[PDB]
Write a protein that binds this ligand. Structure first.
Ligand SMILES: CC(C)(COP(=O)(O)OP(=O)(O)OC[C@H]1O[C@@H](n2cnc3c(N)ncnc32)[C@H](O)[C@@H]1OP(=O)(O)O)[C@@H](O)C(=O)NCCC(=O)NCCS
Ligand SMILES: CC(C)(COP(=O)(O)OP(=O)(O)OC[C@H]1O[C@@H](n2cnc3c(N)ncnc32)[C@H](O)[C@@H]1OP(=O)(O)O)[C@@H](O)C(=O)NCCC(=O)NCCS
Ligand SMILES: CC(C)(COP(=O)(O)OP(=O)(O)OC[C@H]1O[C@@H](n2cnc3c(N)ncnc32)[C@H](O)[C@@H]1OP(=O)(O)O)[C@@H](O)C(=O)NCCC(=O)NCCS
Ligand SMILES: NC[C@@H]1O[C@H](O[C@H]2[C@@H](O)[C@H](O[C@@H]3[C@@H](O)[C@H](N)C[C@H](N)[C@H]3O[C@H]3O[C@H](CO)[C@@H](O)[C@H](O)[C@H]3N)O[C@@H]2CO)[C@H](N)[C@@H](O)[C@@H]1O
Ligand SMILES: NC[C@@H]1O[C@H](O[C@H]2[C@@H](O)[C@H](O[C@@H]3[C@@H](O)[C@H](N)C[C@H](N)[C@H]3O[C@H]3O[C@H](CO)[C@@H](O)[C@H](O)[C@H]3N)O[C@@H]2CO)[C@H](N)[C@@H](O)[C@@H]1O
Ligand SMILES: NC[C@@H]1O[C@H](O[C@H]2[C@@H](O)[C@H](O[C@@H]3[C@@H](O)[C@H](N)C[C@H](N)[C@H]3O[C@H]3O[C@H](CO)[C@@H](O)[C@H](O)[C@H]3N)O[C@@H]2CO)[C@H](N)[C@@H](O)[C@@H]1O
Lengths: 274, 274, 274
């Protein structure tokens, strides 16, 4: 591929001449990524000479259960291969989609990034692995199937995709801006977001479990239900207005540790920034 | 097994004397299927001499990212092993369940086919991988568990299964016709269908995301919610009556490309067939 | 690890000096478990000399499709490695969580046991694999993210976790008793239980599909919906009172086979124990 995966971005910044020790049975995709480096099956590992790469999450659990792993820092010294959505201490990219710091999501949102459904994902955003993000099929035609186009010749493909781009309900997310997910967002298990109608999820939004959101979620609102309805705002109006332009999620690691009291007490946060 | 898998049906029609090149680390099930053929780890692949079989979907993505793959047509020259529900250009079978053309579904619906819960799946049907199809346990007894029968002797098993067949609410889908899923059907993510009470899903039906359907879905109806309620019909009544017996989903690949305008414009479809 | 996995508990009781035959490609975790025993790739298997261990569930299906498997009893002679939640004929443990007999659950509930969210799981309980059990993040602060704490030093971690323990809404299930799931419970697909607010699920409870439960479920109640509401009780009040202290789920395998008629007919059950 032309766009670097999460494993390749981590290695580019933290490997630093060491050889990669593979903790687990590798995939063909992994062997292609490790081709330029020296790599081997992990036996005796030393973080001064080695960088452990666990193939799967279950292989990571086995590695952390090993006594050899407690001299290995999270991303500086190891990583999970099959974890494109895993959180990171630095801003990264996922199929031309910027992902903030300490932001994690599941395989469904990863596939949504590759489909072009997402424009950006904020910092300190927590998304459950079971969450799904898909677009709508076309509804202005006699059929709803998408793989019917596998039978169209050119002449038929040109006219089918012609109406697709000229559709105000955005089938396959064709005619809309890619959806943005803000910072400090929480998304629960079994949640769903429609990539055809949702174009923005505000910062600090909370999506309940089993919730099916079909429209935009304003910042710091808690949407819940099937379909998702706003049941309560997370903060007061004055806080949401202030929080939107102070942007604590863009602070440095030292500045977050300086204003712990402001981030911990919401009543103190307004006092310092209202 | 006695019933051919999707990989075996594809190979039986398109392999044509070539040897299989395995793109990825194979499973024991795959090695059993490839036993009669000549097979090897894929290196340099040529579609005139080789047929690429990617073990998993992630191995398929790695194969398509390789320059060698662009002389390989979808099913005629490659396929994914762990993809029993993947779409195909020809009608196939899945555990004694006929599956139409360009119809795809996930692992939960595959397991539903093997359980005998499904009778047939139409053509050009799109089912999300997260969709689940299960039956109800028995409710006319003091227990709801199913694996309690692991402790029954013969005498106890005969009487337990005796009432199971004599139950009008169809526990474990015992006393009903297997459920039929029509053509041009769309099923969203996190959807659920009760195999104990649902016996038919009409052609052209649309099941929303997170929807739990518990009764039959009439053709070209859009069921939505927990539980699923009909919120709107996809087409006018006159169209549904006409569409049910013209059956465009049974047209040839040449006839679909002949009547693209009818399938693309619903207003034109009635003009040509009303 | 210090706590035995489900595979290690089964082997400790049923292996009995035999060598393990691995049906499938093993993981690194599996190789660590089989280290003290003699093990090999399964070829010709005899239950008098061998104990088959299928790595994955798909490898189990391949094994049962083999003619060699029909002299192998379920747990006494084989088992699936990647199946920590699979049912068993004897009471077992899962990350310091007692699991009853013939009780099965999915990977999400397994991870919930390791997180400390569950105290015990009853006997003859049926939980769907797609079910999820998670706790709530903190809501009394300006942020909702959990992995923000990866940036806190000591001083910041001590004060963040300080309010976490002093929170009546139980973020991360910090200040509550671990949730108990009773016996003869049925949980459907796509179900969700909030580990932060739910502390008990009574015996004989039934959770419908796609249901999001947020409070305790009384014994023998059927909760349904988003959010889950009690729609109907499974039995009469007099039965629930009697069933709660006869505890048929604690009977021996011989006593279950003695009182099949009582367990099969609910009307007969009260006659014998009311
Ligand atoms: C969304 C959530 C944070 C709400 O937390 P909360 O502040 O304690 O909400 P409350 O318990 O006070 O109840 C608020 C109302 O909204 C409803 N509600 C809240 N969360 C709901 C949910 N997931 N689903 C359905 N209804 C919900 C409640 O039924 C309640 O109804 P009411 O208006 O009649 O009182 C929490 O319930 C939740 O579901 N978090 C997601 C859990 C998860 O999936 N984690 C995995 C991802 S890490
Ligand atoms: C079902 C679906 C096609 C409806 O499309 P639509 O024609 O644009 O429906 P609308 O947006 O006009 O809204 C219709 C009504 O039904 C509701 N509704 C529609 N889809 C819903 C859904 N999945 N869940 C809950 N409610 C839904 C809407 O809330 C709305 O309510 P209203 O009567 O008060 O106005 C679409 O919403 C959907 O969910 N598709 C499934 C997406 C998916 O899961 N893809 C993965 C599988 S490939
Ligand atoms: C929960 C369940 C056992 C109810 O069975 P039941 O006794 O036949 O319930 P009924 O069909 O008589 O309907 C009862 C009412 O509750 C509703 N209801 C029942 N189950 C529901 C469900 N999963 N979701 C939403 N609504 C449900 C029905 O819509 C109905 O509504 P009403 O009050 O207007 O009549 C069953 O519907 C179910 O969903 N089982 C879980 C299936 C599953 O997920 N299996 C996989 C795990 S092994
Ligand atoms: N290109 C996105 C892909 O998404 C995959 O995950 C999901 C889907 O994108 C994937 O797509 C299915 C596919 O199974 C099947 N073989 C073909 C079918 N047309 C697709 O259907 C789906 O994907 C396409 C996007 O390409 C959408 O246009 C369509 O609306 C949607 N139903 O099925 C998976 C479960 O629904 C993988 N995560 C990933 O390998 C890949 O990035
Ligand atoms: N035979 C169907 C199987 O379905 C599997 O997928 C799902 C279930 O069928 C499977 O079945 C579970 C099983 O985990 C566990 N080891 C035993 C338990 N009795 C089963 O329970 C389930 O399956 C049976 C059907 O056999 C139903 O009667 C029962 O109502 C249902 N709860 O758990 C999986 C998640 O719920 C596999 N896709 C597939 O290997 C296999 O075909
Ligand atoms: N320690 C529990 C783990 O749960 C895992 O499954 C699920 C989660 O526990 C897991 O945790 C995610 C994780 O993906 C990501 N790398 C880090 C993130 N902080 C976690 O987030 C989640 O887990 C933690 C519990 O540790 C909760 O406090 C948090 O509320 C929750 N959002 O993401 C998975 C899907 O949501 C695995 N089943 C298992 O390896 C492991 O036991």
């Amino acid at each position: 591929q032309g766009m670097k995966t999460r494993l390749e971005q981590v290695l580019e910044r933290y490997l630093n001449g060491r050889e990669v020790a593979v903790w687990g049975v590798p995939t063909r995709r992994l062997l292609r990524a490790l081709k330029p480096f020296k790599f081997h099956t992990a036996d005796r590992v030393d973080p001064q000479y080695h960088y452990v790469v666990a193939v799967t999450d279950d292989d990571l659990t086995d590695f952390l259960s090993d006594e050899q792993s407690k001299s290995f820092q999270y991303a500086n010294d190891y990583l999970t291969f099959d974890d494109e959505g895993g959180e990171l201490p630095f801003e990264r990219m996922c199929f031309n989609v910027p992902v903030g710091r300490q932001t994690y999501f599941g395989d469904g949102v990863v596939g949504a990034c590759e489909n072009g459904y997402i424009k950006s994902i904020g910092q300190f955003t927590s998304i459950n692995g079971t969450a799904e993000i898909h677009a709508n099929h076309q509804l202005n035609m006699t059929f709803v199937s998408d793989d019917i186009q596998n039978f169209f010749n050119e002449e038929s493909m040109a006219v089918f995709q012609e109406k697709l781009r000229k559709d105000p309900k955005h089938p396959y997310a064709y005619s809309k801006e890619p959806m943005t997910i803000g910072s400090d967002v929480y998304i629960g298990a079994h949640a769903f977001i429609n990539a055809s109608t949702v174009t923005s999820i505000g910062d600090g939004a909370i999506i309940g479990s089993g919730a099916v959101v079909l429209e935009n979620v304003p910042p710091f609102a808690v949407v819940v239900g099937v379909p998702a309805r706003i049941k309560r705002y997370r903060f007061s109006k004055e806080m949401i207005e202030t929080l939107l332009r102070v942007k604590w999620w863009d602070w440095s690691i030292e500045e977050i540790n300086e204003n712990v009291d402001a981030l911990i007490s919401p009543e103190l946060f307004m006092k310092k920034y209202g």
